[PDB]
């Protein structure tokens, strides 16, 4: 049937919950805003629920992970940012299209970290039209996803990895003095479901 995008109304508590998580998880980064831009809030202009009967591939894998993890799939809602959001919502996450950065699909609990990836690694060259990484005009997109972490392997760097170590299902790169915030990585596209599609703009500091 394909993906059906359902619009959430801002007066719906599901809409508010999603925006709140995004707006409150904004943190300042050490790069002076070079990658994701300079801003204190987002102008959330749209939130759509992604419906794709993907859910099954996702639920199936979740069962495998659970058996393998003492009946604990260890789900977390996390943000994802990359230049391939539209492909993802239709075809699902795919580890074959993966790219420091290893060969995994990255997620973050802080929206501002995922915003740095919207136009690519380090923000790339910025938006296609103005080639500005701090564009306040162009609409950006990011996903708030269900991520099956199962047994996570914790470490200080992930540029090295291609797969989760034995007995594990995800890799969490953590802060050193190295990273500033945690990054969650999976190596199988089916361990993540693109629950919400957020359309937004970063707003200039008032
Ligand atoms: C048709 C089609 C064409 C191109 N793509 C597709 C796709 N794509 C992913 O599922 C994907 C996106 C970004 C990363 N991906 C990350 O999450 C990390 C790195 C990376 O490449 C760098 C960027 C974000 C950070 C840093 C890894 C995987 C999924 C489904 C279809 C696709
Ligand atoms: Zn722009």
Author numbering: 1104 to 1156, 1158 to 1203, 1207 to 1284, 1286 to 1314
What does the paper say about this structure?
The two highly homologous human tankyrase isoforms, TNKS1 and TNKS2, are members of the poly ADP-ribose polymerase (PARP) family of 17 proteins that share a catalytic PARP domain. These PARP proteins cleave NAD+ into ADP-ribose and nicotinamide and transfer the ADP-ribose units onto their substrates, resulting in a post-translational modification referred to as PARsylation. Tankyrases also mark axin, the concentration-limiting component of the β-catenin destruction complex, for degradation, and tankyrase inhibition antagonizes the Wnt signal transduction pathway by stabilizing axin and promoting β-catenin degradation. So far, two different classes of potent and selective small molecule tankyrase inhibitors, 4-((3aR,4S,7R,7aS)-1,3-dioxo-3a,4,7,7a-tetrahydro-1H-4,7-methanoisoindol-2(3H)-yl)-N-(quinolin-8-yl)benzamide (IWR1) and 2-(4-(trifluoromethyl)phenyl)-7,8-dihydro-3H-thiopyrano[4,3-d]pyrimidin-4(5H)-one (XAV939), have been identified.
The crystals of the TNKS1/2 complex diffracted to 1.9 Å with synchrotron radiation. There are two crystallographically independent TNKS1/2 complexes in the crystal structure, highly similar to each other (with a backbone rmsd of 0.6 Å). The TNKS1/2 complex structure reveals that 2 does not bind to the nicotinamide pocket but instead occupies a different pocket, which is not present in either apo or XAV939 bound tankyrase structures. It only becomes available upon the binding of 2 and we thus refer to it as the induced pocket. This induced pocket is created by the movement of Phe1188 of the α3 helix and the D-loop, part of which is disordered in the present crystal structure, away from one another. The binding of 2 to the induced pocket of TNKS1 suggests that IWR compounds are likely non-competitive inhibitors of tankyrases. In the crystal structure, 2 adopts a conformation in which the central phenyl is almost perpendicular to the norbornyl group and rotated by about 60° away from the plane of the amide group. There are three hydrogen bonds between 2 and TNKS1. One of the two carbonyl oxygens of the pyrrolidine dione group is hydrogen bonded to the main chain NH of Tyr1213 and the carbonyl oxygen of the amide group is hydrogen bonded to the main chain NH of Asp1198. The CH at the 6-position of the quinoline is also involved in a CH…O = C hydrogen bonding interaction with the main chain carbonyl oxygen of Gly1196.
